[PDB]
Amino acid sequence: MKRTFQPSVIKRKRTHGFRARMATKKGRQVLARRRAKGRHRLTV
Amino acid sequence: NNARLYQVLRGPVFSEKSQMLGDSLGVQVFKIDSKATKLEVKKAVELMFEGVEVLKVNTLNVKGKTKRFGKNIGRRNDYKKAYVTLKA
Amino acid sequence: PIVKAKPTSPGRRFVEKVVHPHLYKGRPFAALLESKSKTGGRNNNGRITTRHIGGGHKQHYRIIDFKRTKDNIPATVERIEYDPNRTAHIALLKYADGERRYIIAAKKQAVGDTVMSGEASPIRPGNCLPLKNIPLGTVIHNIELKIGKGAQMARAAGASVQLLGRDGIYAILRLRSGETRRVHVNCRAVIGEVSNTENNLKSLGKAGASRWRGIRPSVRGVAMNPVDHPHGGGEGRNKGRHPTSPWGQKSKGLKTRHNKRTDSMIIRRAKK
RNA sequence: CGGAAGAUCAAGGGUUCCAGUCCAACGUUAAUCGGGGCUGGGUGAGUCGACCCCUAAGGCGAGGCCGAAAGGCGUAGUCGAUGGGAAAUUGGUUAAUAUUCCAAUACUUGUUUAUAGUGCGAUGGAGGGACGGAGAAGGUUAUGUCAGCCUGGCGUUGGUUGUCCAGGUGAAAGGAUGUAGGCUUACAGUUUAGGCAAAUCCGGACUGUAGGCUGAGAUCUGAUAGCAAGGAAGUGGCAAAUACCAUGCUUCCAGGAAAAGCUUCUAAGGCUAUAAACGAAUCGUACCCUAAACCGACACAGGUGAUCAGGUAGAGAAUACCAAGGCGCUUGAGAGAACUCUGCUGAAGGAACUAGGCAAAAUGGUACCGUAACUUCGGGAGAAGGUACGCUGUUGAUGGUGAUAGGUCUCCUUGAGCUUUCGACAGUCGCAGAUACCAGGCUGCUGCAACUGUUUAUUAAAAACACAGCACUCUGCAAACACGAAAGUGGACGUAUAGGGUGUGAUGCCUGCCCGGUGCUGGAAGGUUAAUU
C-alpha cells in the first residue's frame, strides 16, 4: 500500500535544508546543537 | 590570460572510443579542467598544438565512481572531458 | 423568472432556476476585471475563521463603481451582465467620453437608456443623487453611509430602501431589515429597486449545486462529541442544553451588538 | 505476457549501464551466472530539458505597524512552477550516447562591420498573450489491410507452375501552395469631459468612399536518402483513431489564472531594410522506472503520475488467441496416503443445511414481440415472459468512396473496383449456432433513510453524517462571528433576496396544549448592592 515516506527533493530541501534552518532563530539553534554534538550531517 | 590556457588541458583520453574517433573523424579526446568552457578548450587546443584549427568542442562532465577499499567507502574525482573536432 | 426542471433525475426534481434571457451571453469587459482567488474561509494565520467555505467555480472580480462620481456626464447602458460575485445584475455604462464602468443594475433598467449622476439628475432608476435632492417616498438603493465612501447598504438582488423623511442634516430610511435609521443627507443613493428580484425564489435542488457555489457541508452540533461542541454527547439523540454556537454563545435570541459609537444613528427596529 | 510482464519519460535512486575477470560472502539451492567482488570503459546539444525572462498559490519583505524580549504582520519590491515565453527532422553508427556524434536537408536568435533611408526612446498607456463545462456534425492524418511490384520457393504425406507460397518493399522536418472548415465590412478625414501626465496609439462622436485573416490535410518540392539475398522493388484501392483542423463551432450556468515575451503610443531624455563575417555560454543526458535499481527492514504477490497503443474476432483501452518486443517469475527430483487449499463432474432428491440459501449452482448478448401494482407522471422497466440467431446458394433494398467518360487543391451527370447496413427465399449439419472467453437471476409482503454522496486508514458503510428544503434567531457594516497578545486578517473587495449560529431534514398531508422551572427579550416602581468618598 502507500507508505509514509514518499520522497521529494524539493520538499526535503525546502522544509529541512540549510537555508530553511538558517532562516529561523530556532533552526539556527538546531544547527548549533548539531555542531556541538559534532554531527557530520548538519542538514538533509 | 595565457597562464590559464596551460591548465585547461589535463590529459588525453586513451580508450577504444577515443581511438575510434581519432581514426575515423580525427577528433581529440581530452581530460579538461572541471571549470573550463568550450571556448577556453578551443583556445587551449589551438594554442598548445600549433598548426591546427578547431572546428567544434563537445564537452561533458562525468561523475567519479564509488570504489571502496578496506573498511572505507571512498569515491574517485569527478572530471570533465572534451571532444575536439579539427579542421583536417 | 423561475423555471422548474423536469424530474428526469432525482437531483433535478427540485431545481428551480432563475432565468434571465436579457443578460449578456458574452464575456465581461476585460478592462474592468481582476483576478480573485478563494480563501477557503482562512485568514492570514491560515486558520478557518469562516466555516463552510471551500471550492466552487473560478470567478473574476468585476470592478463596480459604487461611488458614482462621474457627475453630469450621461452614460448609456451598453449591456446588462450576470456577476458571479453578487446576486444583483450589473449594468455596463458607456459615458459620453467613452469611459466604461460597471454599476449595480436597477430592476427597471434596460439596455440603451441613459443614467446620470450628480445633483441635477432626473428621478429615474439608475441615477445617483445626494439624499437631499431625492424626494421623500421614492424607492432607492445603494445607500452611502459616509460621504464619498461609496454605496454600502441595499446592494443585494431585490434590495430597496424607503426614504421616509428628513430631520435636519439626516435622512430617515426604512431598511429591509425593518430598521429605521438616519443617514447624512449629503450621502448618495440610487433610484429604484435592485434587479434580480426572484433571487430568493430559486431552489438549488441538490447538494452539488451548493458545492458549485463554494459552500462546504455543515455539521450540526448535536451530531458531534462533547469535545467538539457544547451540543455534543448523549446516548442517542439529545440536546440537553440551551442552544449555543461551537464557542458557547447562545443562538436563540441573544443579541450581539457592541457598537456604542453608532448607537445614535439608529431610530428604531420592528417587532414581529 | 502482449492497454504488458513490450516501449518513452517524470519522480525517486545513483553507476545498478558496457566489457573483461573472479565465486569466498551476497543471491532463500548449485552457479562457470548476476543488479555480488575487482579492474577498465561509457553519458558529446543554439533547436530535448534545466538554467534564463514572466508570473499563481504561497514565502521573505528598505521604510511602516504592532509586540516584555524573542518576535508577529505588512507596502514598494523580491522570490516562488505544477502554468506562459525562440527554433529539426529523417537515416546511419558504439559493447555501451545520440533529435547531442556522422550525412543530408532545415529553422531560431544574436554580435560586429558596411550601404542606404531616418525621430528614437519606458518599469508608463493601449492592444495582444488569454484560457470554463458539456455536446455535435464533419474533413483528415497516424495507422491498418488488400493489392501492385521485387526477391526467393516448387515442399519428407494426397495435391500444389498457380486464381500457388513466403519474405521484402510506402522518407521526415522544412519551403512553396492556400484546400475542407472557422472568423470577418475596409479605408480616408474631422474632432475629443476618457486611458493618473503625453500620444500620430486605443476609447468616444461625427462625414464620404466600396474579398481579407486563420487553417488540418492533399499536391509539388525536399528526394538520385536509407534499407536484403551482394546487387531489387518502392505505387493503387479500401478502412480508419481518443491524435489533428479545434484556444474552432453549438449550447449551458456553476460565468471560466496572472504576468511577461510580442505589436503599437508617446514621457523625461538610436532605429528600419540590405547583406557579409562571426557566434549561441553553463548544467543534465548512462541505466531502472506496473521495478530485483523508487516507497514498503528482503532480489517482498502491495503502492507509484504521464506518454505510445499492431493483428483476427469484438461496441470496446472488456475478453480470447497472436505480432513487434520481452519473458518461463533463483531450489529441484520422485511418489501419487490421510488431511488442507484450489478446481471439475455427480444417481435420486432439491434448502430437508443453517442463526441466515453463507457458499455454490443458476441468469447473462443482439433484435423483435410483450410487460402488473403503484407513481412525484420522470419512472417502475432490462419489470415479468417469449421468439429468432451457424453455414451454403439465390435474391431485393441501401449508405460511403469514387477510376472511366460527357458538360481548375473547382462544379454537375453516369457511374467500374472496394466498402457499409438492413431483408427475403431455398437448402444444409449437429445434442447443442449469443456454441469458447465474455456476459442481469427474478418476484411478493414489510421496517428504516427521500434520493447521488460521506464515515470509524487497520474487526462497525449503517437506520450514523451530509444533503437540497424548512424554521428560529443574530447581524445596519469598522456587521455579527472567527484567528490573533496586538497590529493585521478572514466574513467580503460581500451589504438583510446578505452573512453567522442553531435545530430539523426531498416530497404529500401537516405540526395540538403548557411561559410554572431554566434561558432569551423588553421594563424599572420598589428592595439589596462594589470600588470610591
Author numbering:
A (entry chain Ba): 1 to 44
B (entry chain Sn): 2 to 89
C (entry chain Cl): 2 to 273
Relevant lines from the article:
For the Balon-bound ribosomes, particle classification revealed that nearly two-thirds were also associated with the ribosome hibernation factor RaiA (state 1), whereas another third did not contain RaiA but were instead bound to mRNA and tRNA (state 2). The tRNA-bound ribosomes also contained density in the nascent peptide tunnel, indicating the presence of peptidyl-tRNA. Overall, these data suggested that Balon can associate not only with vacant but also with elongating ribosomes. In the absence of a P-site tRNA (state 1) the lasso loop is poorly ordered, but in the presence of a peptidyl-tRNA (state 2) it is stabilized by contact with the 3′-CCA end of the tRNA. However, when Balon binds to the ribosome, it sequesters this N-terminal tail using a unique loop (absent in other aeRF1-type proteins), which we term the bL27 trap. This finding explains the well-defined electron density of the nascent peptide observed in our cryo-EM map (state 2), highlighting Balon’s ability to prevent premature release of nascent peptides by translationally inactive ribosomes. By contrast, we show that Balon has the unique property of binding to not only vacant ribosomes, but also ribosomes bound to mRNA and peptidyl-tRNA, illustrating that ribosomes can enter a hibernation state before terminating their protein synthesis.
Here, by combining cryogenic electron microscopy, genetics and biochemistry, we identify Balon, a new hibernation factor in the cold-adapted bacterium Psychrobacter urativorans. We show that Balon is a distant homologue of the archaeo-eukaryotic translation factor aeRF1 and is found in 20% of representative bacteria. During cold shock or stationary phase, Balon occupies the ribosomal A site in both vacant and actively translating ribosomes in complex with EF-Tu, highlighting an unexpected role for EF-Tu in the cellular stress response. Unlike typical A-site substrates, Balon binds to ribosomes in an mRNA-independent manner, initiating a new mode of ribosome hibernation that can commence while ribosomes are still engaged in protein synthesis.
